């Protein structure tokens, strides 16, 4: 356990919250600073495969998250032009047996609140409206600066300040890499969505230069919808690219079931999709980058928040194992071993995820090939998914 | 049979020769005019699947063609960058049982000579150094004009004057459509080719914007090699595009086994690859277009000469069936019924063949998808090939 340990976490998204929870459950003294004046997340869906669900269960929060989640029976891929089913991933008891938990979907806001509440309950000291302005390592401590003029001492600090991380600048000068794709979301009362057939699955329509995803939330009462498309504005240097004037033309070539979806999306806000090139080293002295600060992906594998959750589990587990015997002096080795375990995993998600989205967005003969590949696969095989959903950091 | 019938054939390529043979075997009076001063073909390979081999057998010439041919055990597709086997089409006894004949390869020159010799033996009157300058229909006869100032009367005329057909202008004003790809050939003494492993198959290396094919000829004594690549010169308006200064860069990204091949090719001559858009109607009065004049493909399905051979069989069979009972008056109906049977078949080859070559030449994620599609297929299935190799015109 981590009783005598002190950890400061810079950032209170899903990542920082999950780390606060995992560390406080080991008995660590955890202080978390969040920039925003309240804890919160977007009131729309995310997907959490068994690689995240098993970890939530270990922390004792999965039952509760599920009480407010939805349990899809399958992930279903459809052609966005014809609406034809291409393939399904069965998320039933064999899936759950194999991977040690369910594949679920829920509101980001609910998952985030659940984590924050559990971290507090476990002893974490969370602070809102506080920005971490610097982290340095001096001797055997991290020294953390905040925007109220204070400095704080801890054993280690976690840089969990997201895609636009400034703490990352201590290690890398890279900038976010634009995908040229933009994401829109919507949640609609389920019954207000014009549906030809009801939805109890995660449905992904994949088409030339676009996709469209639907899934139920909150026990089937709401439908989450997500539209991702290639922005022509981006290729022309528009700074504020991907705006809603692009949506109608971006989908004009798709099936009516996809085109009807667009009307339900929120149009006041969107998410231009960026990632970063993979980096191996996430550690600067007694600071480690985790979550999107270390490994921000494009969302094709629906695993960014899951990776941040995995990060928490690995950090807490490896530290509790080694700090007990080696104390504070052991922290740099612990960070190194966490980085060595996590980088190959997460960097494969970044890179493979780019290829996976490309595979979705093919046109022409390439689309013909992709459709037939999906149709004819051995659905009993897990070779395309075991690397993702079957990973564990357990040593 | 066709005893009282008179047919004039404009063109003496593989198509015209095969039609001369098929018609003369039915007892028709056949006169064939060829522009060139000698009958001949290129001294390099072509492939003849069972859809052509069965027909040659019916005419009694397959045994003889085979005595000078090669019988590959498989068609083998390899990735042009890695040289990895992707899939094989087994050409063994089950294949031959299914499709009614062998898949063989031979010299174009030999097949052509064999057909010409057999057409002569069967009674066809062949003439070299004679160009057909016009064909018109007057009453119940075709009237054919030649470049020695003569005119000739027949019951029907076949326009078999190739990709650059002028007779086609009677029916369509279309021009050849450039693929932007160019083909080079070579034959090398088998033993002079630097081979890591010996070849007893048709091998197709398929890569980004290029392919490379090898197969043995003449009982394994020579190796046929064919290089097809996307010409940058074409996209820049070079009239004489696809020249050999393009070959080295076109293959630079390929595996050594492909790159070594280029040195063996003839560099003095090449074949810029054109086809035509499919047309339904091939008949103008008592003239019918057949062979490349009617349906010139890109060569990805290795079936252009085979289609011309099929044309001959259908024409001869359908005419012999109906002329016997209806005489000369029946010829326009016969041509219509031959056109109705042949156009959907051949036009599917034109169109599908374009998609098939595109499938070969994919890059990026599309190539990744295509490779995996090929690898994982049900090799016991014939669904990708029965339309091609299992067709018959028999009614
Ligand atoms: C499972 C759904 C359908 C996936 C169908 C085809 C996916 C990719 C095809 C191209 C990749 C070919 C890779 C060939 C090698 C291979 O299988 O490696 C395997 C590794 O495969 C890979 O590493 C390929 C990974 C490609 C991405 C897979 C996506 C999984 C599903 C994620 C869904 C997210 C939510 C979507 C919401 C709509 C290992 O093979 P080995 O065990 O034989 O060695
Ligand atoms: C046989 C070798 C490997 C071919 C592998 C994949 C080929 C094409 C994949 C994309 C086409 C998907 C078409 C899906 C529908 C389908 O199967 O239709 C089927 C029709 O398929 C087609 O009509 C597709 C045809 C695509 C071309 C096939 C090529 C055959 C091999 C020619 C080799 C020439 C020499 C090469 C020298 C190197 C009918 O399906 P149904 O019976 O279920 O109805
Ligand atoms: C359209 C879309 C769909 C997605 N869907 C899925 C999905 O289905 N499943 C999945 O697992 N993932 C998904 N993701 C990925 C997931 O959203 C992210 O990977 C994940 O939320 C990252 O969490 P984080 O805590 O590392 O970073 P963030 O969520 O960015 O949190 C960083 C926090 O740090 C705060 N902050 C910033 N700087 C400072 C500072 N200096 N001091 C203090 N606080 C600071 C910010 O206010 C923010 O609260 C998706 C992403 C997108 C864009
Ligand atoms: C690189 C390449 C590879 C190929 N490989 C294969 C393969 O493996 N298998 C396959 O089956 N097919 C293949 N083909 C296709 C095949 O070559 C052609 O489809 C076929 O040869 C066409 O035969 P044809 O008799 O209709 O026309 P052509 O071969 O063009 O013959 C037309 C003839 O008419 C003559 N002529 C022209 N105008 C006149 C006139 N006015 N009067 C008299 N004579 C005239 C010409 O001199 C010529 O001899 C390939 C083609 C290419 C380019
Ligand atoms: Cl993601
Ligand atoms: Cl992801
Ligand atoms: Cl051809
Ligand atoms: Cl062809």
mmCIF file of C-alpha atoms in Angstrom, chain A residues 101-382:
data_model
loop_
_atom_site.group_PDB
_atom_site.id
_atom_site.type_symbol
_atom_site.label_atom_id
_atom_site.label_comp_id
_atom_site.label_asym_id
_atom_site.label_seq_id
_atom_site.Cartn_x
_atom_site.Cartn_y
_atom_site.Cartn_z
ATOM 1 C CA UNK A 101 -16.327 -7.762 -18.082
ATOM 2 C CA UNK A 102 -19.044 -6.177 -20.151
ATOM 3 C CA UNK A 103 -18.829 -3.727 -23.042
ATOM 4 C CA UNK A 104 -21.054 -0.880 -21.933
ATOM 5 C CA UNK A 105 -21.951 2.660 -22.902
ATOM 6 C CA UNK A 106 -22.913 5.564 -20.624
ATOM 7 C CA UNK A 107 -22.926 9.351 -20.300
ATOM 8 C CA UNK A 108 -19.448 10.802 -19.919
ATOM 9 C CA UNK A 109 -20.855 13.100 -17.258
ATOM 10 C CA UNK A 110 -22.098 10.182 -15.196
ATOM 11 C CA UNK A 111 -18.943 8.145 -15.403
ATOM 12 C CA UNK A 112 -16.917 11.217 -14.458
ATOM 13 C CA UNK A 113 -19.114 12.087 -11.503
ATOM 14 C CA UNK A 114 -19.052 8.518 -10.267
ATOM 15 C CA UNK A 115 -15.243 8.478 -10.349
ATOM 16 C CA UNK A 116 -14.966 11.909 -8.588
ATOM 17 C CA UNK A 117 -17.430 10.821 -5.867
ATOM 18 C CA UNK A 118 -15.552 7.567 -5.298
ATOM 19 C CA UNK A 119 -12.129 9.306 -5.242
ATOM 20 C CA UNK A 120 -13.478 11.720 -2.571
ATOM 21 C CA UNK A 121 -14.947 8.883 -0.563
ATOM 22 C CA UNK A 122 -11.606 7.098 -0.672
ATOM 23 C CA UNK A 123 -9.814 10.120 0.707
ATOM 24 C CA UNK A 124 -8.648 12.150 -2.241
ATOM 25 C CA UNK A 125 -8.494 15.894 -1.779
ATOM 26 C CA UNK A 126 -9.962 17.431 -4.895
ATOM 27 C CA UNK A 127 -9.817 21.064 -5.788
ATOM 28 C CA UNK A 128 -11.613 22.940 -8.444
ATOM 29 C CA UNK A 129 -10.792 26.315 -9.898
ATOM 30 C CA UNK A 130 -7.080 25.708 -9.486
ATOM 31 C CA UNK A 131 -4.576 25.640 -12.361
ATOM 32 C CA UNK A 132 -1.206 23.933 -12.174
ATOM 33 C CA UNK A 133 1.268 26.358 -13.658
ATOM 34 C CA UNK A 134 4.513 24.356 -13.259
ATOM 35 C CA UNK A 135 6.022 21.125 -12.006
ATOM 36 C CA UNK A 136 9.717 20.676 -11.266
ATOM 37 C CA UNK A 137 11.696 17.940 -9.524
ATOM 38 C CA UNK A 138 14.154 18.973 -6.822
ATOM 39 C CA UNK A 139 15.954 16.229 -4.939
ATOM 40 C CA UNK A 140 13.478 13.455 -4.087
ATOM 41 C CA UNK A 141 10.245 15.561 -4.434
ATOM 42 C CA UNK A 142 8.058 17.093 -7.082
ATOM 43 C CA UNK A 143 7.372 20.723 -6.513
ATOM 44 C CA UNK A 144 4.079 21.847 -7.987
ATOM 45 C CA UNK A 145 3.063 25.450 -8.627
ATOM 46 C CA UNK A 146 -0.516 26.635 -8.751
ATOM 47 C CA UNK A 147 -2.148 29.862 -10.018
ATOM 48 C CA UNK A 148 -2.936 31.187 -6.547
ATOM 49 C CA UNK A 149 0.789 31.677 -5.957
ATOM 50 C CA UNK A 150 1.295 28.585 -3.869
ATOM 51 C CA UNK A 151 3.796 25.747 -4.250
ATOM 52 C CA UNK A 152 3.195 22.193 -3.071
ATOM 53 C CA UNK A 153 5.498 19.330 -2.304
ATOM 54 C CA UNK A 154 4.812 15.727 -3.196
ATOM 55 C CA UNK A 155 6.583 12.445 -3.899
ATOM 56 C CA UNK A 156 5.410 12.487 -7.543
ATOM 57 C CA UNK A 157 3.107 14.506 -9.812
ATOM 58 C CA UNK A 158 0.820 13.318 -12.568
ATOM 59 C CA UNK A 159 0.490 15.493 -15.632
ATOM 60 C CA UNK A 160 -3.067 14.747 -16.671
ATOM 61 C CA UNK A 161 -3.869 17.996 -18.416
ATOM 62 C CA UNK A 162 -5.279 16.550 -21.670
ATOM 63 C CA UNK A 163 -4.681 16.800 -25.405
ATOM 64 C CA UNK A 164 -3.541 20.446 -25.094
ATOM 65 C CA UNK A 165 -1.175 19.631 -22.182
ATOM 66 C CA UNK A 166 1.291 22.297 -21.304
ATOM 67 C CA UNK A 167 3.098 20.026 -18.853
ATOM 68 C CA UNK A 168 3.946 17.829 -21.850
ATOM 69 C CA UNK A 169 6.258 20.667 -23.066
ATOM 70 C CA UNK A 170 8.740 19.534 -20.354
ATOM 71 C CA UNK A 171 9.297 16.383 -22.384
ATOM 72 C CA UNK A 172 8.291 17.060 -25.992
ATOM 73 C CA UNK A 173 7.900 20.037 -28.229
ATOM 74 C CA UNK A 174 5.374 18.360 -30.507
ATOM 75 C CA UNK A 175 2.047 19.837 -31.446
ATOM 76 C CA UNK A 176 -1.337 18.176 -31.990
ATOM 77 C CA UNK A 177 -1.702 16.590 -35.456
ATOM 78 C CA UNK A 178 -4.985 17.359 -37.267
ATOM 79 C CA UNK A 179 -6.864 14.461 -38.700
ATOM 80 C CA UNK A 180 -8.919 16.708 -40.920
ATOM 81 C CA UNK A 181 -12.007 15.067 -39.504
ATOM 82 C CA UNK A 182 -14.576 16.680 -37.168
ATOM 83 C CA UNK A 183 -16.962 15.032 -34.697
ATOM 84 C CA UNK A 184 -20.477 16.161 -33.771
ATOM 85 C CA UNK A 185 -22.654 14.699 -31.052
ATOM 86 C CA UNK A 186 -26.283 14.597 -30.083
ATOM 87 C CA UNK A 187 -28.502 12.975 -27.508
ATOM 88 C CA UNK A 188 -32.159 12.797 -28.283
ATOM 89 C CA UNK A 189 -35.002 11.315 -26.386
ATOM 90 C CA UNK A 190 -35.140 7.858 -27.808
ATOM 91 C CA UNK A 191 -38.755 8.087 -28.806
ATOM 92 C CA UNK A 192 -38.179 11.385 -30.663
ATOM 93 C CA UNK A 193 -35.759 9.816 -33.015
ATOM 94 C CA UNK A 194 -37.365 8.724 -36.276
ATOM 95 C CA UNK A 195 -36.270 5.024 -36.293
ATOM 96 C CA UNK A 196 -37.321 2.451 -38.918
ATOM 97 C CA UNK A 197 -36.025 -0.273 -36.614
ATOM 98 C CA UNK A 198 -35.245 0.016 -32.941
ATOM 99 C CA UNK A 199 -31.627 0.101 -31.671
ATOM 100 C CA UNK A 200 -30.233 -2.106 -28.850
ATOM 101 C CA UNK A 201 -26.668 -2.170 -30.199
ATOM 102 C CA UNK A 202 -23.789 0.174 -30.887
ATOM 103 C CA UNK A 203 -24.334 0.841 -34.628
ATOM 104 C CA UNK A 204 -21.519 2.246 -36.800
ATOM 105 C CA UNK A 205 -22.295 3.314 -40.345
ATOM 106 C CA UNK A 206 -19.038 3.586 -42.212
ATOM 107 C CA UNK A 207 -18.789 5.377 -45.529
ATOM 108 C CA UNK A 208 -16.582 7.311 -47.857
ATOM 109 C CA UNK A 209 -14.940 10.132 -45.813
ATOM 110 C CA UNK A 210 -17.447 9.796 -42.999
ATOM 111 C CA UNK A 211 -19.068 7.730 -40.331
ATOM 112 C CA UNK A 212 -22.149 7.849 -38.124
ATOM 113 C CA UNK A 213 -22.590 6.053 -34.815
ATOM 114 C CA UNK A 214 -25.698 5.419 -32.730
ATOM 115 C CA UNK A 215 -26.246 3.819 -29.378
ATOM 116 C CA UNK A 216 -28.777 3.935 -26.559
ATOM 117 C CA UNK A 217 -28.024 5.468 -23.171
ATOM 118 C CA UNK A 218 -29.620 5.401 -19.703
ATOM 119 C CA UNK A 219 -31.442 2.111 -20.078
ATOM 120 C CA UNK A 220 -32.790 2.862 -23.577
ATOM 121 C CA UNK A 221 -34.418 6.241 -22.822
ATOM 122 C CA UNK A 222 -32.024 8.335 -24.894
ATOM 123 C CA UNK A 223 -30.125 7.723 -28.142
ATOM 124 C CA UNK A 224 -26.565 8.943 -28.547
ATOM 125 C CA UNK A 225 -25.626 9.927 -32.071
ATOM 126 C CA UNK A 226 -22.164 10.873 -33.410
ATOM 127 C CA UNK A 227 -21.241 12.163 -36.872
ATOM 128 C CA UNK A 228 -17.648 12.236 -38.001
ATOM 129 C CA UNK A 229 -16.664 13.558 -41.418
ATOM 130 C CA UNK A 230 -13.800 14.844 -43.460
ATOM 131 C CA UNK A 231 -13.750 18.677 -43.403
ATOM 132 C CA UNK A 232 -13.094 20.381 -46.729
ATOM 133 C CA UNK A 233 -12.480 23.591 -44.758
ATOM 134 C CA UNK A 234 -9.535 22.019 -43.071
ATOM 135 C CA UNK A 235 -7.658 21.399 -46.325
ATOM 136 C CA UNK A 236 -8.121 25.112 -47.176
ATOM 137 C CA UNK A 237 -6.613 26.549 -43.960
ATOM 138 C CA UNK A 238 -9.825 27.548 -42.181
ATOM 139 C CA UNK A 239 -8.709 28.117 -38.563
ATOM 140 C CA UNK A 240 -12.127 27.283 -37.130
ATOM 141 C CA UNK A 241 -12.634 24.303 -39.397
ATOM 142 C CA UNK A 242 -15.382 21.636 -39.327
ATOM 143 C CA UNK A 243 -18.326 23.902 -38.753
ATOM 144 C CA UNK A 244 -21.954 22.836 -39.251
ATOM 145 C CA UNK A 245 -22.321 24.418 -42.674
ATOM 146 C CA UNK A 246 -20.254 21.418 -43.798
ATOM 147 C CA UNK A 247 -22.562 18.677 -42.417
ATOM 148 C CA UNK A 248 -25.206 18.464 -45.138
ATOM 149 C CA UNK A 249 -22.747 18.024 -48.079
ATOM 150 C CA UNK A 250 -20.465 15.731 -46.036
ATOM 151 C CA UNK A 251 -23.352 13.188 -45.824
ATOM 152 C CA UNK A 252 -25.188 13.810 -49.103
ATOM 153 C CA UNK A 253 -23.959 10.508 -50.600
ATOM 154 C CA UNK A 254 -25.155 8.403 -47.607
ATOM 155 C CA UNK A 255 -28.266 6.371 -46.962
ATOM 156 C CA UNK A 256 -31.379 8.138 -45.606
ATOM 157 C CA UNK A 257 -30.924 6.481 -42.219
ATOM 158 C CA UNK A 258 -27.615 8.314 -41.909
ATOM 159 C CA UNK A 259 -28.818 11.618 -43.456
ATOM 160 C CA UNK A 260 -31.794 11.788 -41.041
ATOM 161 C CA UNK A 261 -29.356 11.512 -38.138
ATOM 162 C CA UNK A 262 -27.656 14.810 -38.815
ATOM 163 C CA UNK A 263 -30.719 16.823 -37.740
ATOM 164 C CA UNK A 264 -30.472 15.560 -34.200
ATOM 165 C CA UNK A 265 -26.920 16.608 -33.575
ATOM 166 C CA UNK A 266 -25.953 19.590 -31.419
ATOM 167 C CA UNK A 267 -24.771 22.260 -33.920
ATOM 168 C CA UNK A 268 -23.450 24.858 -31.462
ATOM 169 C CA UNK A 269 -20.265 22.989 -30.554
ATOM 170 C CA UNK A 270 -18.102 20.314 -32.330
ATOM 171 C CA UNK A 271 -14.835 18.469 -31.832
ATOM 172 C CA UNK A 272 -12.136 18.852 -34.478
ATOM 173 C CA UNK A 273 -10.208 15.609 -34.165
ATOM 174 C CA UNK A 274 -6.509 15.753 -33.366
ATOM 175 C CA UNK A 275 -4.031 13.234 -31.925
ATOM 176 C CA UNK A 276 -0.304 13.291 -31.359
ATOM 177 C CA UNK A 277 2.525 11.226 -32.721
ATOM 178 C CA UNK A 278 3.455 8.438 -30.241
ATOM 179 C CA UNK A 279 6.263 9.131 -27.765
ATOM 180 C CA UNK A 280 8.094 6.549 -25.657
ATOM 181 C CA UNK A 281 9.218 8.604 -22.670
ATOM 182 C CA UNK A 282 6.482 10.164 -20.460
ATOM 183 C CA UNK A 283 8.615 10.886 -17.381
ATOM 184 C CA UNK A 284 10.443 14.074 -16.318
ATOM 185 C CA UNK A 285 12.070 13.375 -12.927
ATOM 186 C CA UNK A 286 9.169 12.763 -10.552
ATOM 187 C CA UNK A 287 6.492 13.838 -13.019
ATOM 188 C CA UNK A 288 4.762 11.375 -15.316
ATOM 189 C CA UNK A 289 2.376 12.300 -18.147
ATOM 190 C CA UNK A 290 -0.738 10.074 -18.245
ATOM 191 C CA UNK A 291 -4.039 10.028 -20.034
ATOM 192 C CA UNK A 292 -4.392 12.261 -23.135
ATOM 193 C CA UNK A 293 -1.363 14.308 -21.954
ATOM 194 C CA UNK A 294 0.778 11.212 -22.729
ATOM 195 C CA UNK A 295 -1.226 9.439 -25.493
ATOM 196 C CA UNK A 296 -4.167 11.322 -27.091
ATOM 197 C CA UNK A 297 -5.753 9.146 -29.798
ATOM 198 C CA UNK A 298 -8.251 9.588 -32.573
ATOM 199 C CA UNK A 299 -11.396 7.966 -31.260
ATOM 200 C CA UNK A 300 -11.856 5.121 -33.697
ATOM 201 C CA UNK A 301 -11.040 2.464 -31.098
ATOM 202 C CA UNK A 302 -13.180 4.155 -28.409
ATOM 203 C CA UNK A 303 -10.387 3.674 -25.913
ATOM 204 C CA UNK A 304 -8.876 7.093 -24.923
ATOM 205 C CA UNK A 305 -10.651 7.311 -21.563
ATOM 206 C CA UNK A 306 -10.177 3.587 -21.178
ATOM 207 C CA UNK A 307 -6.374 4.065 -21.582
ATOM 208 C CA UNK A 308 -6.444 6.769 -18.895
ATOM 209 C CA UNK A 309 -8.290 4.295 -16.630
ATOM 210 C CA UNK A 310 -5.720 1.603 -17.410
ATOM 211 C CA UNK A 311 -3.035 4.111 -16.571
ATOM 212 C CA UNK A 312 -4.494 4.579 -13.136
ATOM 213 C CA UNK A 313 -4.702 0.878 -12.432
ATOM 214 C CA UNK A 314 -1.098 0.241 -13.561
ATOM 215 C CA UNK A 315 0.328 3.186 -11.624
ATOM 216 C CA UNK A 316 -1.506 2.256 -8.402
ATOM 217 C CA UNK A 317 -0.759 -1.406 -8.652
ATOM 218 C CA UNK A 318 2.922 -1.121 -9.528
ATOM 219 C CA UNK A 319 3.501 1.612 -6.902
ATOM 220 C CA UNK A 320 1.726 -0.282 -4.134
ATOM 221 C CA UNK A 321 3.794 -3.310 -4.938
ATOM 222 C CA UNK A 322 7.161 -1.494 -4.793
ATOM 223 C CA UNK A 323 6.737 1.528 -2.442
ATOM 224 C CA UNK A 324 5.883 -0.808 0.418
ATOM 225 C CA UNK A 325 9.373 -2.305 0.315
ATOM 226 C CA UNK A 326 11.434 0.649 -1.123
ATOM 227 C CA UNK A 327 9.610 3.794 0.117
ATOM 228 C CA UNK A 328 9.937 7.249 -1.493
ATOM 229 C CA UNK A 329 13.306 6.454 -2.996
ATOM 230 C CA UNK A 330 11.612 3.890 -5.218
ATOM 231 C CA UNK A 331 9.365 6.435 -7.084
ATOM 232 C CA UNK A 332 11.585 7.101 -10.094
ATOM 233 C CA UNK A 333 11.888 3.364 -10.780
ATOM 234 C CA UNK A 334 8.190 2.887 -10.331
ATOM 235 C CA UNK A 335 7.461 5.681 -12.879
ATOM 236 C CA UNK A 336 9.930 4.092 -15.312
ATOM 237 C CA UNK A 337 8.313 0.671 -15.010
ATOM 238 C CA UNK A 338 4.802 2.150 -15.451
ATOM 239 C CA UNK A 339 6.015 4.056 -18.547
ATOM 240 C CA UNK A 340 7.687 0.929 -19.978
ATOM 241 C CA UNK A 341 4.473 -1.121 -19.564
ATOM 242 C CA UNK A 342 2.065 1.574 -20.780
ATOM 243 C CA UNK A 343 3.836 3.161 -23.783
ATOM 244 C CA UNK A 344 3.839 0.136 -26.115
ATOM 245 C CA UNK A 345 0.189 -0.574 -25.298
ATOM 246 C CA UNK A 346 -1.050 2.920 -25.734
ATOM 247 C CA UNK A 347 1.142 3.762 -28.735
ATOM 248 C CA UNK A 348 -0.263 0.749 -30.554
ATOM 249 C CA UNK A 349 -3.733 2.145 -29.941
ATOM 250 C CA UNK A 350 -2.700 5.545 -31.384
ATOM 251 C CA UNK A 351 -1.161 4.071 -34.490
ATOM 252 C CA UNK A 352 -3.559 1.234 -35.130
ATOM 253 C CA UNK A 353 -6.449 3.513 -34.453
ATOM 254 C CA UNK A 354 -5.365 5.802 -37.269
ATOM 255 C CA UNK A 355 -5.343 2.802 -39.699
ATOM 256 C CA UNK A 356 -8.723 1.591 -38.341
ATOM 257 C CA UNK A 357 -10.381 4.955 -39.052
ATOM 258 C CA UNK A 358 -8.822 4.989 -42.510
ATOM 259 C CA UNK A 359 -10.346 1.541 -43.048
ATOM 260 C CA UNK A 360 -13.772 2.947 -42.172
ATOM 261 C CA UNK A 361 -13.535 5.872 -44.558
ATOM 262 C CA UNK A 362 -12.472 4.081 -47.778
ATOM 263 C CA UNK A 363 -14.182 4.712 -51.109
ATOM 264 C CA UNK A 364 -14.248 3.087 -54.523
ATOM 265 C CA UNK A 365 -12.797 -0.315 -55.070
ATOM 266 C CA UNK A 366 -11.116 -0.058 -51.656
ATOM 267 C CA UNK A 367 -14.585 0.138 -50.061
ATOM 268 C CA UNK A 368 -15.720 -2.846 -52.100
ATOM 269 C CA UNK A 369 -12.722 -4.827 -50.701
ATOM 270 C CA UNK A 370 -13.289 -3.585 -47.136
ATOM 271 C CA UNK A 371 -16.967 -4.532 -47.184
ATOM 272 C CA UNK A 372 -16.228 -8.033 -48.393
ATOM 273 C CA UNK A 373 -13.472 -8.439 -45.794
ATOM 274 C CA UNK A 374 -15.869 -7.531 -43.040
ATOM 275 C CA UNK A 375 -18.664 -9.795 -44.379
ATOM 276 C CA UNK A 376 -16.614 -12.951 -44.820
ATOM 277 C CA UNK A 377 -14.583 -12.897 -41.577
ATOM 278 C CA UNK A 378 -14.429 -15.737 -39.056
ATOM 279 C CA UNK A 379 -16.759 -14.263 -36.451
ATOM 280 C CA UNK A 380 -15.566 -16.903 -33.896
ATOM 281 C CA UNK A 381 -12.049 -15.589 -34.103
ATOM 282 C CA UNK A 382 -10.760 -12.950 -31.686
#
